[PDB]
Protein backbone atom coordinates (compact mmCIF):
# COMPACT_ATOMS: atom_id res chain seq x y z
CA UNK A 1 0.00 0.00 0.00
CA UNK A 2 2.35 2.72 1.24
CA UNK A 3 6.04 2.88 0.40
CA UNK A 4 8.78 4.96 2.12
CA UNK A 5 8.46 7.77 -0.39
CA UNK A 6 4.67 8.23 0.06
CA UNK A 7 5.04 7.97 3.84
CA UNK A 8 7.86 10.46 3.62
CA UNK A 9 5.91 12.89 1.42
CA UNK A 10 3.05 12.75 3.89
CA UNK A 11 5.58 13.09 6.70
CA UNK A 12 6.48 16.62 5.52
CA UNK A 13 5.33 19.33 7.96
CA UNK A 14 5.18 17.18 11.06
CA UNK A 15 7.05 17.02 14.34
CA UNK A 16 9.31 14.15 13.35
CA UNK A 17 11.59 12.07 15.47
CA UNK A 18 14.79 10.61 14.18
CA UNK A 19 16.79 7.87 15.75
CA UNK A 20 20.33 8.01 14.49
CA UNK A 21 22.43 4.87 14.06
CA UNK A 22 24.06 5.32 17.40
CA UNK A 23 21.21 5.51 20.07
CA UNK A 24 23.09 8.30 21.80
CA UNK A 25 21.40 10.99 19.75
CA UNK A 26 17.84 11.68 18.47
CA UNK A 27 16.43 14.81 16.81
CA UNK A 28 12.84 15.95 17.38
CA UNK A 29 11.93 18.77 15.01
CA UNK A 30 9.60 19.66 12.14
CA UNK A 31 10.52 17.99 8.86
CA UNK A 32 11.28 20.44 6.10
CA UNK A 33 12.51 18.46 3.10
CA UNK A 34 13.76 15.11 1.78
CA UNK A 35 15.44 13.99 -1.48
CA UNK A 36 15.41 10.63 -3.26
CA UNK A 37 18.52 9.65 -1.32
CA UNK A 38 16.41 10.30 1.84
CA UNK A 39 18.57 13.10 3.23
CA UNK A 40 16.78 14.98 5.99
CA UNK A 41 16.38 18.74 6.45
CA UNK A 42 14.48 19.77 9.59
CA UNK A 43 13.59 22.80 11.71
CA UNK A 44 13.89 23.76 15.42
CA UNK A 45 15.21 20.33 16.27
CA UNK A 46 15.62 18.91 19.74
CA UNK A 47 18.56 16.80 20.84
CA UNK A 48 18.09 13.75 23.14
CA UNK A 49 21.30 12.30 24.67
CA UNK A 50 20.17 8.72 25.43
CA UNK A 51 16.71 10.25 25.92
CA UNK A 52 17.37 13.56 27.68
CA UNK A 53 17.43 16.98 25.98
CA UNK A 54 20.77 18.79 25.81
CA UNK A 55 19.20 21.62 23.83
CA UNK A 56 17.09 22.94 20.99
CA UNK A 57 19.03 23.08 17.76
CA UNK A 58 17.29 25.09 15.06
CA UNK A 59 17.19 24.27 11.36
CA UNK A 60 19.27 21.17 10.94
CA UNK A 61 20.49 18.71 8.30
CA UNK A 62 21.19 15.03 8.79
CA UNK A 63 22.85 13.00 6.07
CA UNK A 64 20.90 9.87 5.08
CA UNK A 65 23.74 7.70 6.40
CA UNK A 66 23.61 8.13 10.12
CA UNK A 67 19.88 7.95 10.75
CA UNK A 68 18.55 4.59 11.82
CA UNK A 69 14.93 5.50 11.34
CA UNK A 70 12.45 8.32 11.31
CA UNK A 71 9.15 8.29 13.17
CA UNK A 72 5.97 10.33 13.16
CA UNK A 73 4.84 11.69 16.51
Partner 1 sequence: LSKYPDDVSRLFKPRPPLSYKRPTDYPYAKRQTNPNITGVANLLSTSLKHYXXXXXXXXXXXXXXXXXXXXXXXXXXXXXXXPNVDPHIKDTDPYRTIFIGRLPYDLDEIELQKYFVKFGEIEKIRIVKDKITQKSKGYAFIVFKDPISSKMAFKEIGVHRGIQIKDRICIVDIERGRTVKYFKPRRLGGGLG
Partner 2 sequence: RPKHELSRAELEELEEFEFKHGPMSLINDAMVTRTPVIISLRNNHKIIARVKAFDRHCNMVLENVKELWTEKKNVINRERFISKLFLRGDSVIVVLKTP
Partner 3 sequence: KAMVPPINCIFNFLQQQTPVTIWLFEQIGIRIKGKIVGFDEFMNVVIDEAVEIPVNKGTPLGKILLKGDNITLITSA
Q: Which residues fall within 8 angstroms of residue 53, CB to CB, at 6 or more apart? A: 46, 47
List the x/- string, 27-46, binding to partner 2 by CB under 8 A.
x----xxxxx--xxx-----
Q: Is 72 in the site for partner 3 (CB under 8 A)?
A: yes
Bridge partners of residue 18, in order along the sequence: 27, 70
Residues 5 to 64 in contact with partner 1, rule: CB under 8 A: 20, 22-25, 47, 49, 54-58
Three-state SS for 7? helix
CA 56/CA 38 separation, integer angstroms: 23
CB of 56 to RNA, least distance (A): 25
Q: Which stretch binds partner 3 (CB under 8 A): 17-25, 42-50, 54-62?
A: 17-25
Amino acid sequence: PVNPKPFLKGLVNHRVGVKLKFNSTEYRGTLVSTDNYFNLQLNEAEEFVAGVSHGTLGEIFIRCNNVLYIREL
